[PDB]
Amino acid sequence: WIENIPLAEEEHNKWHQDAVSLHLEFGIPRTAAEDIVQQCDVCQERGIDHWQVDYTHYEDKIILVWVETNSGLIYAERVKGETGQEFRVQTMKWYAMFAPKSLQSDNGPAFVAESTQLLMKYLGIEHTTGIPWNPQSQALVERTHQTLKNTLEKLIPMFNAFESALAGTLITLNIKRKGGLGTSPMDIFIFNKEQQRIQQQSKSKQEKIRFCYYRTRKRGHPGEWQGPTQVLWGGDGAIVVKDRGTDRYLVIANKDVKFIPP
Amino acid sequence: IDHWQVDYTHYEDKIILVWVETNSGLIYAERVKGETGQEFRVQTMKWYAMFAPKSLQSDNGPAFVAESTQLLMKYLGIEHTTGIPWNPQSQALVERTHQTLKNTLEKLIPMFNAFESALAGTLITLNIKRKGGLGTSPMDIFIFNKEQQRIQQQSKSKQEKIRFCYYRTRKRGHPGEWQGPTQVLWGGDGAIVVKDRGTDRYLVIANKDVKFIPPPK
Amino acid sequence: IENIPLAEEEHNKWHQDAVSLHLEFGIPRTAAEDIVQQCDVCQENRGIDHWQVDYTHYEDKIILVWVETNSGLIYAERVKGETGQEFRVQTMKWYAMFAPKSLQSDNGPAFVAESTQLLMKYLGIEHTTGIPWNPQSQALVERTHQTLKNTLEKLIPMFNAFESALAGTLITLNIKRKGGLGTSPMDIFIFNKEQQRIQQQSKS
Amino acid sequence: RGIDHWQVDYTHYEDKIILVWVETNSGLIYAERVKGETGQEFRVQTMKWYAMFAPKSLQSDNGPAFVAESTQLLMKYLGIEHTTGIPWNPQSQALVERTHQTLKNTLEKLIPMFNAFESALAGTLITLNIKRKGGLGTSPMDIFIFNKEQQRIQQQSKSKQEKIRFCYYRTRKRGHPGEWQGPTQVLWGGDGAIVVKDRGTDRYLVIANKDVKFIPPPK
Amino acid sequence: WIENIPLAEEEHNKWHQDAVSLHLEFGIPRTAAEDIVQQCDVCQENKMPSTLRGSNK
Amino acid sequence: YRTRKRGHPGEWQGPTQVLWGGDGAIVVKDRGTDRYLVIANKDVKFIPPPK
Amino acid sequence: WIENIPLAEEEHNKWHQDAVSLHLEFGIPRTAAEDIVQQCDVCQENK
Amino acid sequence: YRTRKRGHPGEWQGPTQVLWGGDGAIVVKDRGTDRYLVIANKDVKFIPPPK
Amino acid sequence: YRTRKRGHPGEWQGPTQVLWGGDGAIVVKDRGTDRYLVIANKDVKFIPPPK
DNA sequence: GCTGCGAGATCCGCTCC
DNA sequence: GGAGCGGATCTCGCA
DNA sequence: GCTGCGAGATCCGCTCC
DNA sequence: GGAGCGGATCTCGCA
Ligand SMILES: [Ca+2]
Ligand SMILES: [Ca+2]
Ligand SMILES: [Zn+2]
Ligand SMILES: [Zn+2]
Ligand SMILES: [Zn+2]
Ligand SMILES: [Zn+2]
C-alpha cells in the first residue's frame, strides 16, 4: 500500500503503464494509480466502470448497446421509444443493477433535454458528451455491433420473438465467451468489484484533511523535523508524503510524525 | 445454495413480479403487462442473462404448466420443482420482502412522476439502501458468494504442482554427480529440502546446485 | 469422455467458439475443430497458436509485426525492405523462437511465392492466404498497430536506437501490461503451451 | 546454475561474430549474429533478449562491452543482477563455453542446407532447442516453459490462511546434545524430521524428532 | 512401426536430430534410430574422432 | 497476549517476549507499532518452561 | 538394414511368407519381421 | 583416417578397411602411395561399412 | 598467491592470511597496494602458519 | 602390425584405546 | 565417544 | 567476497521371451 | 540360452 508507491511511480516512469495495470500489479489503490497516471507529463502530452452507449436497430426494433471499456461487458434491453422519458427510464434502469462512474455518448435528440442533465446530477455519475473522432473508438464500436448481431440468427428459429433473442445474445456473449483461464466478462466485472470495494474501508475514515510533520532518517540520524506536508494515504504504521526538494514520494513510520491542529 | 423464488403482487390494477433469493436475499421487480406465457418466458431468460442460478423453486401458475415452458427450461438446463412450498422460512422471507417493498414504494410516491422510472428507482433504493450484516448490500453478498465459490473451486491449481528436482553435494572439496531425479518436499528461499535414497535421510540443498524438472510420466 | 457429448450438446444449443469449449471442458482441440466444422450454420456464415503477419510504415521505417490471435502476444522487428529472402529469414527466426501451428496473412508479393510456400511446408505449418472473413482479426490487428505506434511514439526519445525503442514497446505491450485476473499477455501464452504439452503427453 | 541465470559470450566462426546466451537451469540457448562488439550493439541485443523473456541474473567475464558505464546503467534500469568472473579464468563461464562446441558442431551440418547464415542459425536453434528431446523425453524449451509457468506468484497468493505452530530444538555437536535455543517457527512438517531456520547462523537445518518438541497450542 | 520409419528418416534428414530424440518422438526402436543416425553421411563426416587409449609395454 | 475493546477480546497475536512480571498485569512490546502495552493476567496465556 | 525394408515388404506382399524366413534371408531383425507379419491381415487372421 | 604433417593434422581420407585392429593404433592401406601406414586411435573415425 | 598479467602468471608472493575462504576462489590482502584481491584456487599454495 | 602417466594433496570410514 | 590411519579421488603437465 | 563442462561413443549386467 | 537395454565410463576441446 504505502510502501510500494515509489516503486509503482518509477516503474510507470520507465514504461508508461496504465492505472489498471499498476493496480493489478503493485496492489496500490485505484485512486493512487489514477493519480499517478494523470500526473504524468508525457501521458498528459480504458478503465473499469467506464461504459459507452451507441444506437442500433434490427428488424425495425429499438435496442440499446452498452459496451464496457475494460471488462468487455455488453448489456441490452428492449426500448419502446426513443423519447427522452423512455431514454431516461433505460439509463437509470441500467444503474439499477450496475454502479459505474463514467459514461460517454454522442449527440442525440434524447441525449440533451432540460430535465436530462438535472436527473443525472442527482445520480452523481459523471457523464461526458462528445464526438468520437478517435479511429480507435470508430473501429472498436464497429466490431461490437457485428459480434452482438451475428449471434441473433443462431437461435431465432426456436425462440418466439426478438426480445427472446435479446437474452440469447447476452447468454452467448457474457456467459460462454471466455479468455485467459476460462474467465467470463461477468467474472471479470465481479472480481473487479471485489478490489473496488476495499478502498471504501480506508477512505471512510480518511475524509478529513490533516497536516503533519515528517522527519527524514539518514544512516540512523534523525536530523530534524520538516514540513508541513499533506498526508496522502494512511497505512498500518506507514505514511507516504511528498518531498518538496527531491520531488519524490517518501515513506515514514508512525513514530516520526505529530499532529498539527487546524 | 443458489435458490430462487418468484412471487407476484397486485397494486393499482397492475401486476409486479418479484424475484427473491433465499440464502442471500436478492430482490428484483418488474412490471408484468399481461398474463400470457410469452412475458414470463422473456422475463425468465432475461433473468438468466443477468443472473447465474443453480436452483429455482416456484408455485403453480396458469402458464407455468405448459409443455413448451418445460422444454424451454430444460433447454436452459435449469431445474424446477412443482408443489406449494412447506418451509415457513421461505414464506416469512417472501412476506417480509413484499411488505418492505410495498412500504418503500408507497413512501416514495411523491418523489417521482413517471411509472417505469418509479419502478426502477424503487429497485435502486431497495437493492442499495438495504444494509445487512456489516453494511453489505444483497448484490454485495451475492458477489461475495460468487467470488468465494470461484476461489474455492480454483484453489486446487496451486496445490497440484509436485515439481521434481535434481541435487548434488560437495565431497572432498569437489562437486559430486547429479543425483536424481527426485521429488522436492519443501522449497523456500535460499534452499530446498529433499529425500535421499542412498541413506534415507532428509537433506537441505541451496539453490546454487539444483535443477528443476517437471514430473515424469 | 462424456465431455465430448456435453460439448456437442452445448454447441448445438448455443453455437459457441472452439476456444471457449476447449478452455471450459478440456476437450481435445481436434474434437473441438471437428464439432465446429460439423455445424452447418457456422460453416455457411480465435485459435490457439494462430498467427497473423503484417507490415507497418513508420515515417520511412519498415516494421514486420506478428500477432497471436488467442493471446495478445506481439513480436515486432525491423526489415530493410519487402523481400522474399528477408521474409523467409524472419519467418524462420519466428518459428525458431515460438512453436506455432497455423498462420494467416493477406495476398502479397513476398507472402505468396513458390520458395516461401515450399519453406513453410518444410516447416510444417498450415497457411491461409486471402481476404479475412471473421470480423475479429482485422479489428484486433488494427488495435495492435495503433497501440504499437502509440507506444513507439511515446518511448522513442528515451532510447537512442530505433530497435531499442521497438524492444521497449514490446516489453510494455507483452509483459508490463496486465488485464483480467492480473495476468500478462505473455503468461497466458506460457500457460496455453504448458496445457498443450501436458495434453499431448497424456494422449501420446 | 540458477533458475533465471544466463551466461553470455562472444565467439568467432569463419569471419562471423556470434553472441550466445545460455540459460543455466533448462539449457536453452539463444544465438545472434552481431556485426561487432561495441557497447551499443550489446545493449540493443541484451535489451531485446530481456524483451523476449524476463531473466533475473546474468554472468559474464571482463570485456570492452560487458563492463562499462552505459551498460551497467542499462542493467540497473532493467533490474538484472550482474556478476563478473575472475579475469584470465575462462573456466568460470563453463556452460557457455561448452554450448559453443555444441553449437558449432551442429551448425557445421546445416550450412549447405541454407544459403543464408541467419537461416542456419535459426535451424540449429530448432534442432538444439525444440527437437533435442533429450533425457527423459523433454526438450529444454519444455523445461523453460514449465519453470516460467510455475513461477506465477498469484498461485502462491491464492491462500492466505494456514496453521501456525512453534517448536523447541537444540543443536547436536559430535553427538553431544546442547540446550534449547528459543522458540522457532516451523517451516515444514514431515515424517521423522523437521526443518528449523537458525537466526544465529541464519541457516536452514534438519532436526530429527528425537531432538524436537512442540509447545502446547493456544487455548 | 514400419509405416512411420520413412517419416523418422525424412525428419532426421531435415533436422539431423539424435537417435534418442527419434526414439522418444516416433516410438521407433532404439536400434532403428541408431541405424538411421549412423547411416547419415553428414553426421558421419562431422562426427568427433574416436577416443580409445592403450598402455605402455 | 490478547487485546480487549470494551469487553470484547481479540486474538493471541502470536508469541512475544516478556518484559517484567507485575501483580495483576504484565507489560509487553508490540512489533507492529513498537509501542509498549499492558495486558491483564487473565488475558495472558503462559508458555510452560521446557521439560 | 533400413534400405531393404520396403523391398522386403513388397516381397512379403508378393509371397506372404513367415517372419523367420524373412529375418534369416534378409538380415532384418526378428522384432521387425514379427511386427511386419503382425501388420499382415491375412497372416494375422489365420493364426 | 588422417595423417599429421609437422604436427598439424591433415584432411580426412577414406573410407578404408581396418586391415589390423590394435588397441593403441591400427594399420591401414593407402591407395595413393600403395604403402602401409600405422594411425593412432586419436586420428581415426570408425564408421559402419558402406553398401 | 600469484597474479596473472596478460595470461602469464607472475612470481609467487606471500605468505599471507586467507581473509575469506571460498570453494571457487579466495580473497587475500595485499601489502604493496593495500587493496583486496580475489585469487582463484589454481594460483594458490596452502601452507601451515609460520612461527 | 601398438599403446598415458603419477606425485602431491585432502578428506571419510574405519577401529582401537 | 576421542583418536590415528589406509585408501579412493582429484587435477595438471610433462612431450 | 566464488566457482568446469557435456556430447558422442562403447561395451557389461541385467531380465524377459 | 538368445535378445535388447539402461546406465556407468571414457576423452577432448571449447575460452
Ligand atoms: Ca620428449
Ligand atoms: Ca569465451
Ligand atoms: Zn506516464
Ligand atoms: Zn455451431
Ligand atoms: Zn543426420
Ligand atoms: Zn503376409
Numbering used by the authors:
A (entry chain C): 1 to 45, 58 to 274
B (entry chain D): 60 to 276
C (entry chain B): 2 to 46, 58 to 216
D (entry chain A): 58 to 276
E (entry chain I): 1 to 57
F (entry chain H), H (entry chain N), I (entry chain F): 226 to 276
G (entry chain M): 1 to 47
Question: What did the publication describing this PDB structure actually write?
Answer:
A multimer of retroviral integrase (IN) synapses viral DNA ends within a stable intasome nucleoprotein complex for integration into a host cell genome. Reconstitution of the intasome from the maedi-visna virus (MVV), an ovine lentivirus, revealed a large assembly containing sixteen IN subunits. Retroviral integrase (IN), the enzyme responsible for this process, catalyzes two consecutive reactions: (i) 3′-processing, during which IN hydrolyses 2–3 nucleotides at the vDNA ends to liberate 3′-hydroxyls attached to invariant CA dinucleotides, and (ii) strand transfer, wherein IN utilizes the 3′-hydroxyls to cleave the chromosomal DNA, simultaneously joining the 3′ vDNA ends to target DNA (tDNA) strands. The amino-terminal domain (NTD) consists of a compact three-helical bundle stabilized by coordination of a Zn2+ ion; the catalytic core domain (CCD) features the RNaseH fold and harbors the invariant D,D-35-E catalytic triad; and the carboxy-terminal domain (CTD) adopts an SH3-like beta-barrel structure (reviewed in Jaskolski et al.).
Here, we describe high-resolution structures of the MVV intasome in two functional states: (i) prior to engagement of tDNA and (ii) following strand transfer. We collected single-particle cryo-EM data on the MVV intasome assembled in the form of the CSC and purified under conditions used in our previous study. The reconstruction was refined to an overall resolution of 3.4 Å. In agreement with the previously reported MVV CSC structure, which was refined to ~5 Å resolution, the present reconstruction lacked features consistent with LEDGF/p75. The CSC and STC structures recapitulated the MVV intasome architecture harboring sixteen IN subunits in a tetramer-of-tetramers arrangement. The CIC is formed from a pair of CCD dimers provided by IN tetramers I and II, plus a pair of synaptic CTDs derived from IN tetramers III and IV. Comparison of the CSC and STC structures confirmed that the intasome does not undergo extensive conformational changes upon tDNA binding and strand transfer. The CTDs from eight IN subunits form a pair of C2 symmetry-equivalent tetrads stabilizing the hexadecameric assembly via intra- and inter-tetramer CTD-CTD interactions as well as via contacts with vDNA. Importantly, the lentiviral intasomes share two unique features: intra-tetramer CTD-CTD contacts and an α-helical configuration of the CCD-CTD linkers. Using site-directed mutagenesis, we demonstrate that the hexadecameric assembly is essential for MVV IN strand transfer activity and virus infectivity.
